[PDB]
């Protein structure tokens, strides 16, 4: 039994009615469960037997369907409802999950707070240097971070990492790290991080001179 969920992802505003679907390659009656998985956590059962609400689950969650087509509904999307939602059949073995529908939240644009961190003394003493540019609590997720070393545009020596969407204020945070050897790091003075984002009317640059 191949389980097909749709859509793969969606973004909805807080308080919106959200409906996702799950299609089985053959009739599975009502032997269908829905699970909610937040990042870094195990899935949690919400709906069993296609339409029965699990004990303790808020009433804004519901499900329906029979045979092949099933739906899952959040009547009023809450900030804490962001997750990937899965359907799971138990018609016969082996049990199988759907691919999952990622429910994200649209909120108003929010500009990042930008911080820059020079490498510590003890990190340089180990032979490596990592300059971090921090973008805190912004929306949308899209953001451009460019590194400048003595006003020279870097390319290929930086890595980015973005958090999942916050379950309270629906923002993202991003860490951009410029990684160099201690020797290459000592060859330059000014290290700069330029941030372009929808919430900033102009790109923001945070920088420091080596040693401060």
């Amino acid at each position: 039994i191949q389980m097909t969920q749709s859509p793969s992802s969606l973004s909805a505003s807080v308080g919106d009615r959200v409906t996702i679907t799950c299609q089985a390659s053959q009739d599975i009656s009502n032997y269908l469960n829905w699970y909610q998985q937040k990042p870094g956590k195990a899935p949690k059962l919400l709906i069993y037997d296609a339409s029965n609400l699990e004990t303790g689950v808020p009433s804004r969650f519901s499900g329906s369907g029979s045979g092949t087509d099933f739906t899952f509904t959040i009547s009023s999307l809450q900030p804490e409802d962001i997750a990937t939602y899965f359907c799971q059949h138990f018609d016969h073995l082996p049990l199988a999950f759907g691919g999952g529908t990622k429910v994200e939240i649209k909120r108003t644009v929010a500009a990042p707070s930008v911080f820059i961190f020079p490498p510590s003394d003890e990190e340089l003493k180990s032979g490596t240097a990592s300059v971090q540019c921090l973008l805190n609590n912004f929306y949308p997720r899209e953001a451009k971070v460019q590194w400048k070393v003595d006003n020279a545009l870097q390319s290929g020596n930086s890595q980015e990492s973005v958090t999942e969407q916050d379950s309270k204020d629906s923002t993202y945070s991003l860490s951009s790290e410029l990684t160099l050897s201690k020797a290459d790091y000592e060859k330059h003075k000014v290290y700069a991080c330029e941030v372009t984002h929808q919430g900033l009317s102009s790109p923001v640059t945070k920088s420091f001179n080596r040693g401060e």
Binding site: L45, D49, E54, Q88, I116, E122, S161, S175
Partner: protein, 214 residues
Amino acid sequence: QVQLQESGPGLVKPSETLSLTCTVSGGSVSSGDYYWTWIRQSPGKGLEWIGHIYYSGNTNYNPSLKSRLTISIDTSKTQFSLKLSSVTAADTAIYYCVRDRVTGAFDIWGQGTMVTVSSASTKGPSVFPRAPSSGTAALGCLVRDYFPEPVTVSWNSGALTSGVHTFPAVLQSSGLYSLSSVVTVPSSSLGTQTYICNVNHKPSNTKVDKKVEP
């Protein structure tokens, strides 16, 4: 409520035998209402049902893994186990032990344990402080050059959670992971409040409490 917890090596070599144990606490394992289940999750396979065992010892496996699958149960110790032999890089995943109602519902999950299939040896991380630069002040911790995943970070032993952002690990060109955790605090409390990030890397049994000073 019943709690399930996986335990076992987070790193296993190819061809070798992956062994996991689930410890059921708070409730008995000799129940006729549940199938004691293993489920794994990876980006390439999604959520995949491995198999389960009934407290009488009868098992049911996924045909995809059936050749290399062994699930046992020990009702005296309230445990059930997973043995997966002849492991492949395709077996690297998060493994969960799950309680499944006989009516058909995974209603209790363990937190899941990350198993990486690699020829390399475990390496504990080095932890470096990201001192505040100086409104609100940002500080952080750099957890770098560890293997395998994962590393967990808390601040002040879990008493400081507001404003904490722990980023996903990044793979470096050296083949090791590095991770960053940050927290935003009022610049006023820098003098009076001490900030410790607690780094735990279970695969290497590494615990580090790194104080972040101005």
